Write a protein that binds this DNA or RNA. Structure first.
Lengths: 63, 177, 88, 76
RNA sequence: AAAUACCACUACUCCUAUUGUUUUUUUACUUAUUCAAUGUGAAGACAUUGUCAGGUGGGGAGUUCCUUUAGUCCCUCGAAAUUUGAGGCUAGAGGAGAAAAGUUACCACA
């Protein structure tokens, strides 16, 4: 939108990029407090072990 | 408050370009469609975000005492003097830098000129009357000023010799307390 | 040495125009500079006089050209504002 | 600019590489997404875009001159 | 502070169900609405927009309010219950005009 007129693909890509941005904002929100000292990676090796791939915004969109 | 006039901003930018390297970086628009602006309240100029200024207009003139970072003041004769409050911007985008050891860093805070017996690092090819921000050995911005000689003359200079003219230092925070 | 502002020296018309003068000891309208375009124009000018002499001709041409570009953008912004406030 | 005479001429000749550094920094993402990267004594005429990128990165971060004076902001 | 037996009342806090009202958030869809075209498509209940109440106004046009004092224990407004604080009344004291001006047992230079 300055190409073709393919609005269905336009809308689908807009929705996909929206979901990508939302999921990026989600991880960073839960990232803040994760001590990643170079000699201590316990928290990062745990990150979200206790979540399943329908909870993330991309998981919801993909399902 | 009131925005700066053309001649006033010309003077302020002259001093800021005397001390700094890039200024379109300062006046560049940001990610959220916001930019930094210049405002004058009681012959003081304040570097502040446009959103903060537009939300600060609700305050009556007699009741606004500060806004953003105070760069300096316009004097009665119409000249701009920069401040230790404006030091952080200078550290961010400084043109010339001078590192001082502890033996001169403490005197600089007490309010003394920088000496060759104090200098610990130079910036190569510094002209005579240029803009140099004074840091310590820990890369902590300590002040700013104008240097006395060039790099070659400073090297050839007596170690008990003036290399920088003090103009502002962090000790004034111990004053306005 | 005494200042020409201290002395009541009338303005003289040269190649540089005098322009519309204003009465002495009266209200001179403050033209507020707040637009990014005018800021760019002033900032580019200040950098030009600060850098000064450059050996390369293309360097000189590009410095003058960026000043010219800033002035054109500033003038275009003012013309757009004028049209906006005149029609709408 | 890493030429010796040009290196000493630097300040006097007013040679600033800020435009090139900024252009490289801005183009890094598009280069990362470019799939044509690995489709390929000399110092310049190198056939691989990845090799050119590596040379630019070496110039910006690990320079022959003033290696330990590089701005930490640029490095990071 | 308040004292328990006896029997009378209403005061809140936490749960439940249906024989019901509203308000808010998320999501879904077009009819409110936004954009493009002429001899119909996309977006979308958010925007944008409108109206009243204010805050500010060193910019534009026109012209030449609070604070202190004393009193009646006179009214309102808050607040604690057995009293206060803030306004209100009466008349003294403070605050040509964005050009600049006045001032100092201070500072630097002459």
């Amino acid at each position: 939108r300055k190409g073709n007129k393919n609005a269905k693909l336009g809308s689908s890509l807009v929705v996909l990029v929206q979901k990508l941005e939302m999921n990026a904002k989600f991880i960073e929100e839960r990232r803040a407090k994760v001590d990643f000292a170079p000699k201590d990676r316990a928290q990062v090796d745990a990150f979200l072990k206790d979540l399943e791939w329908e909870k993330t915004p991309l998981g919801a969109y993909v399902v | 408050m009131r925005p700066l006039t053309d001649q006033e901003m010309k003077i302020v930018l002259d001093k800021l370009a005397n001390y700094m390297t890039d200024l379109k970086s300062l006046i560049a628009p940001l990610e959220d469609g916001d930019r930094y602006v210049f405002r004058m309240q009681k012959d003081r100029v304040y570097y502040v975000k446009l959103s903060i200024a537009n939300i600060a207009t609700c305050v009556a003139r007699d009741k606004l005492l500060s806004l953003g970072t105070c760069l300096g003041k316009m004097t009665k004769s119409g000249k701009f003097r920069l401040h230790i409050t404006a030091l952080p911007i200078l550290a961010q985008n400084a043109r010339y830098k001078i590192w001082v050891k502890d033996n001169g860093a403490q005197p600089f805070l007490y309010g003394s000129n920088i000496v060759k017996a104090h200098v610990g690092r130079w910036t190569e090819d510094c002209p005579e009357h240029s803009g140099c921000v004074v840091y310590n050995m820990a890369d902590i911005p300590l002040g700013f000023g104008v240097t006395a000689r060039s790099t070659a003359e400073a090297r050839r200079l007596d170690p008990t010799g003036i290399v920088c003219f003090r103009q502002a230092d962090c000790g004034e925070y111990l004053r306005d307390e | 040495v005494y200042s020409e502002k201290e002395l009541g020296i009338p303005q003289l018309n040269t190649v540089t125009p005098v322009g519309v003068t204003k009465p002495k000891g009266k209200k001179k309208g403050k033209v507020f500079v707040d637009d990014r375009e005018s800021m760019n124009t002033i900032l580019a000018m200040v950098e030009a006089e600060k850098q000064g002499q450059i050996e390369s001709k293309i360097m000189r041409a590009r410095q003058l050209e960026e000043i010219r570009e800033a002035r054109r953008i500033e003038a275009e912004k003012k013309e757009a504002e004028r049209k906006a406030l005149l029609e709408n | 600019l890493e030429g010796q005479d040009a290196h000493n001429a630097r300040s006097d000749l007013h040679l600033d590489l800020s435009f090139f550094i900024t252009n490289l920094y801005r183009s890094l993402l598009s280069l990362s997404l470019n799939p044509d990267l690995e489709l390929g004594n000399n110092k310049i005429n190198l056939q691989t875009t990845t090799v050119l990128l590596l040379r630019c990165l070496t110039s910006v971060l690990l320079p022959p001159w003033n290696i330990r004076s590089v701005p930490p902001i640029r490095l990071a």
